[PDB]
Amino acid sequence: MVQVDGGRFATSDLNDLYRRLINRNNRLKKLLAQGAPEIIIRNEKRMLQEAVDALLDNGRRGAPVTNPGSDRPLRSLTDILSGKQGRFRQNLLGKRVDYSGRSVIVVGPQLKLHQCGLPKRMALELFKPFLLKKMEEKGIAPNVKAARRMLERQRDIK
């Protein structure tokens, strides 16, 4: 349940199906108590039945919809597993590495197989933590937090 822009909130589509299930269930109980004409109990037990399908897997008997805006299948639980919109393809399309970088390549003729030229500027970010600490081993920075601010801007690096 997130705060997006101004007042726009944003929630996982599962919450609409969950309200579905919850309301029906409760109205069921209330309708059993209040007295129960048979058709109305069935009609509800039916609705409740379908709802219980929706948070598991939408589209197996028909498809649920957010109100007029998007005729969109509310991501049912297996959808989140199987990745029915291509979420599986994304999952094995990759997660994102924490210490990674990218840049254009250029032939380095005298470089030996053994080595490769990587931009200092890129090396700084990639090996920042290792660098921070090393700064403290030396007189350059008293501590990490210090070392960090020391590097927060370009013009500042001794």
Partner: peptide, 12 residues
């Protein structure tokens, strides 16, 4: 089989 009609047929 698609719900609305069954109920409608049921209590109607």
């Amino acid at each position: 089989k698609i719900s609305t009609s069954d109920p409608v047929r049921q209590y109607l």
